[PDB]
Amino acid sequence: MAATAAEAVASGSGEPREEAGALGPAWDESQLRSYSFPTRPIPRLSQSDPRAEELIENEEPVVLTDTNLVYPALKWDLEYLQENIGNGDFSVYSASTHKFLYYDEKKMANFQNFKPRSNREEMKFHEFVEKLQDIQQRGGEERLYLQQTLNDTVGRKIVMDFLGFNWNWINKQQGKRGWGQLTSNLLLIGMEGNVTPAHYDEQQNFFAQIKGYKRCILFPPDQFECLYPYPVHHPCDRQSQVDFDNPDYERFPNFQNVVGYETVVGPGDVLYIPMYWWHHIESLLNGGITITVNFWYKGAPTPKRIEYPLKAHQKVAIMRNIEKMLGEALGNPQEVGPLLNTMIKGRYN
Amino acid sequence: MAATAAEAVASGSGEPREEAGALGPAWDESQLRSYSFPTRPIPRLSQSDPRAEELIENEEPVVLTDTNLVYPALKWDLEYLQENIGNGDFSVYSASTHKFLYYDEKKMANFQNFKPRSNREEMKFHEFVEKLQDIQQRGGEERLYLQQTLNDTVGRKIVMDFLGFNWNWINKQQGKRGWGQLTSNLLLIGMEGNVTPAHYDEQQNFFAQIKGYKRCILFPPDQFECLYPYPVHHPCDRQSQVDFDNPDYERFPNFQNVVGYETVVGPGDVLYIPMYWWHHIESLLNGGITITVNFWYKGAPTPKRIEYPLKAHQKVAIMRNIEKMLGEALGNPQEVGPLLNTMIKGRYN
Numbered sequence: 054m055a056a057t058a059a060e061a062v063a064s065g066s067g068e069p070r071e072e073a074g075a076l077g078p079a080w081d082e083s084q085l086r087s088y089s090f091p092t093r094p095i096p097r098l099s100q101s102d103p104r105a106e107e108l109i110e111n112e113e114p115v116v117l118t119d120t121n122l123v124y125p126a127l128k129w130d131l132e133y134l135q136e137n138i139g140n141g142d143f144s145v146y147s148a149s150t151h152k153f154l155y156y157d158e159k160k161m162a163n164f165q166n167f168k169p170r171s172n173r174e175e176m177k178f179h180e181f182v183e184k185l186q187d188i189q190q191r192g193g194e195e196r197l198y199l200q201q202t203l204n205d206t207v208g209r210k211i212v213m214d215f216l217g218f219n220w221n222w223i224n225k226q227q228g229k230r231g232w233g234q235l236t237s238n239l240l241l242i243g244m245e246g247n248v249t250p251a252h253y254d255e256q257q258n259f260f261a262q263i264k265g266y267k268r269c270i271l272f273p274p275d276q277f278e279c280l281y282p283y284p285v286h287h288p289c290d291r292q293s294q295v296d297f298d299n300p301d302y303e304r305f306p307n308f309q310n311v312v313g314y315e316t317v318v319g320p321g322d323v324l325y326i327p328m329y330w331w332h333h334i335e336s337l338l339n340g341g342i343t344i345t346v347n348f349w350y351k352g353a354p355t356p357k358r359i360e361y362p363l364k365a366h367q368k369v370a371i372m373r374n375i376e377k378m379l380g381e382a383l384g385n386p387q388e389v390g391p392l393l394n395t396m397i398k399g400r401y402n
Numbered sequence: 403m404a405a406t407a408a409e410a411v412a413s414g415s416g417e418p419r420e421e422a423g424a425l426g427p428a429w430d431e432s433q434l435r436s437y438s439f440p441t442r443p444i445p446r447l448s449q450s451d452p453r454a455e456e457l458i459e460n461e462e463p464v465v466l467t468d469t470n471l472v473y474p475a476l477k478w479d480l481e482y483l484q485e486n487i488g489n490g491d492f493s494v495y496s497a498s499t500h501k502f503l504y505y506d507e508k509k510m511a512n513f514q515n516f517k518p519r520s521n522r523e524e525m526k527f528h529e530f531v532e533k534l535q536d537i538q539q540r541g542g543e544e545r546l547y548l549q550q551t552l553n554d555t556v557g558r559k560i561v562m563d564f565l566g567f568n569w570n571w572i573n574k575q576q577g578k579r580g581w582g583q584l585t586s587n588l589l590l591i592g593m594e595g596n597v598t599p600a601h602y603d604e605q606q607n608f609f610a611q612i613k614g615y616k617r618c619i620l621f622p623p624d625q626f627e628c629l630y631p632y633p634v635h636h637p638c639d640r641q642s643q644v645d646f647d648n649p650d651y652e653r654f655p656n657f658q659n660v661v662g663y664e665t666v667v668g669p670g671d672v673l674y675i676p677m678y679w680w681h682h683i684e685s686l687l688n689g690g691i692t693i694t695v696n697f698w699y700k701g702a703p704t705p706k707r708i709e710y711p712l713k714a715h716q717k718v719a720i721m722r723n724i725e726k727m728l729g730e731a732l733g734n735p736q737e738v739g740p741l742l743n744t745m746i747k748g749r750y751n
């Protein structure tokens with residue numbers, strides 16, 4: 054029965070992997086939040102597996118289990134980083150809810166009726182750690198999520214760890230895919246339960262898990278119609294307007310058709326998040342703090358002769374450009390919507 | 403009472419003008435079709451009136467009563483033209499209904515499920531006149547509408563009449579408005595009751611009435627949202643999808659808000675139809691055949707520095723361009739609609 058046959062391939066992250074030396078289940082289902090949509094698993098392969106190379110060349114997610122990409126960082130933890138990360142400033146987001154929706158500040162100018170559910174604040178690593186402890190011991194509920202690009206200002210031992218990354222492997226990946234340069238490395242440290250809502254990036258991403266576990270739920274670019282991203286000029290550009298915890302099927306009917314790809318990554322796993330793929334990321338409930346470092350690369354330059362039909366991500370690119378052009382022409386982003394409706398109502402719908 | 407005050411300025415063409423020498427009412431109300439929308443009158447002025455110049459400079463319709471634009475052609479009629487128009491071919495449209503919706507043949511390729519309610523056929527003027535008589539005496543109901551650009555091939559006396567047009571006046575109009583060159587002169591001869599459905603042109607137009615009477619109903623460019631033009635790639639591009647005789651308020655709800663500008667033009671009147679203004683044109687019921695010659699001019703070049711806010715016609719221009727671009731990018735016009743809906747549903751509506 055196809056219905057049942059399907060209810061089966063809709064595993065999710067699957068049965069929890071077992072830790073070496075019989076240290077028990079890495080994590081368990083009750084640590085995962087519950088959503089309204091189905092999900093099949095992202096393949097977990099070895100970098101030496103020809104399949105893994107296949108998925109990447111073909112822009113599909115895959116978790117590489119043995120890259121040693123950030124092997125030297127697997128020793129990182131709060132104590133170690135405070136002693137060696139530097140006296141530099143670290144962007145730290147604070148929020149009331151478990152949801153840390155990203156917002157673009159340079160865009161906060163066009164939409165003033167927008168109020169951030171989470172606020173940013175610069176800190177010295179020890180401050181973040183301090184504030185983390187107050188909350189921790191005082192049993193508070195304020196959630197924090199440090200997210201900072203690793204810059205010229207980190208300490209000596211961190212720079213050392215950095216040099217020990219597996220540049221041989223990734224550089225070859227950058228080379229074989231024609232990608233552009235590495236644009237940055239984002240360091241993320243969050244509290245258990247922290248959620249990064251579904252959104253997509255215009256960067257190729259190698260997501261290297263370091264400490265703790267993270268459940269990653271991705272959606273292919275062709276599910277744009279089911280995820281309803283905010284307007285291109287809105288601060289939450291690229292983020293989904295749908296609240297996965299309380300989805301509004303009236304406003305977002307096609308979210309009822311969404312199908313995800315998930316997996317739980319841990320210390321040493323590297324998840325390839327292809328450019329334009331939506332991803333929702335959550336730190337397992339009661340799993341402790343999580344540490345991750347990503348590698349963002351500019352995508353490869355678009356082929357000179359366009360081949361048809363277009364790939365989903367090229368249509369998404371086209372839609373974004375229309376919204377931007379219209380923004381410039383009308384001289385005001387607020388008017389994009391009204392003109393678009395006028396263009397389709399009774400004509401294309 | 404504003405409601406009443408308004409029910410009054412909603413005259414229409416107004417009281418029928420009286421013919422010189424007490425020859426009676428030029429025409430009467432029962433000769434006008436009945437529609438669901440209100441209309442105020444287009445001003446009837448003298449070319450020497452500073453107001454007339456005001457409306458034209460400001461791109462608003464006006465009927466000039468004394469231009470002598472086509473004074474020499476006021477003698478034209480079927481007999482005269484057959485003897486002097488030429489042996490050239492004349493495009494003649496035939497239709498079952500009184501509505502002569504224009505269709506672009508070069509575009510009939512993308513929409514094959516489109517069937518012309520009226521068909522074109524080349525003829526020698528005498529043929530058109532012959533076919534006109536058969537129908538006429540045989541009491542048939544097949545309607546014909548000759549519409550042909552006046553070309554290099556017209557007879558000597560017609561070329562003479564042409565030279566006697568008031569080029570001094572119009573050339574000065576072309577000059578003062580910065581318009582481009584005269585692109586053409588369309589000759590129109592239709593049967594009583596013939597209707598040209600609401601549509602807009604991307605040409606400045608001086609509409610010179612010659613024989614018979616025509617009721618002209620125009621709408622400002624900012625009523626785009628009430629008139630629902632077909633998709634830009636459709637054969638009926640620029641025409642309204644709304645059937646003025648049987649309007650579908652379900653599909654076209656805003657047609658309930660449409661307000662027209664009308665007038666009845668006769669022998670010697672010249673109606674200025676500004677670029678992008680919608681116009682519906684009908685030959686009075688039982689008024690005999692009608693003859694008109696238009697003057698189409700390219701519009702003036704768009705100012706180098708764009709001033710805000712945009713004028714309605716600039717937004718219409720913007721919408722058309724979006725539809726065309728999307729057509730090229732997707733490599734197929736049929737897909738424009740689906741992408742536009744995906745772009746607005748749950749995001750901008």
Ligand SMILES: O=C(O)CC[C@H](O)C(=O)O
Nearest residue numbers: 142144201202203204237
């Ligand atoms: O100073 C900051 O926190 C921003 C650093 C910037 O993202 C970079 O290093 O390129």
Ligand SMILES: O=C(O)CC[C@H](O)C(=O)O
Nearest residue numbers: 241249254258334345347
């Ligand atoms: O790990 C998170 O919570 C956010 C990850 C971020 O979206 C990325 O693209 O690396």
Ligand SMILES: O=C(O)CC[C@H](O)C(=O)O
Nearest residue numbers: 491493550551552553586
């Ligand atoms: O030959 C025809 O009927 C088309 C003539 C063309 O419109 C022109 O004269 O520019």
Ligand SMILES: O=C(O)CC[C@H](O)C(=O)O
Nearest residue numbers: 590598603607683694696
């Ligand atoms: O007079 C007609 O029936 C059609 C007139 C045509 O739309 C024009 O722009 O001159």
Ligand SMILES: [Fe+3]
Nearest residue numbers: 252253254332
């Ligand atoms: Fe991301």
Ligand SMILES: [Fe+3]
Nearest residue numbers: 601602603681
């Ligand atoms: Fe026209």
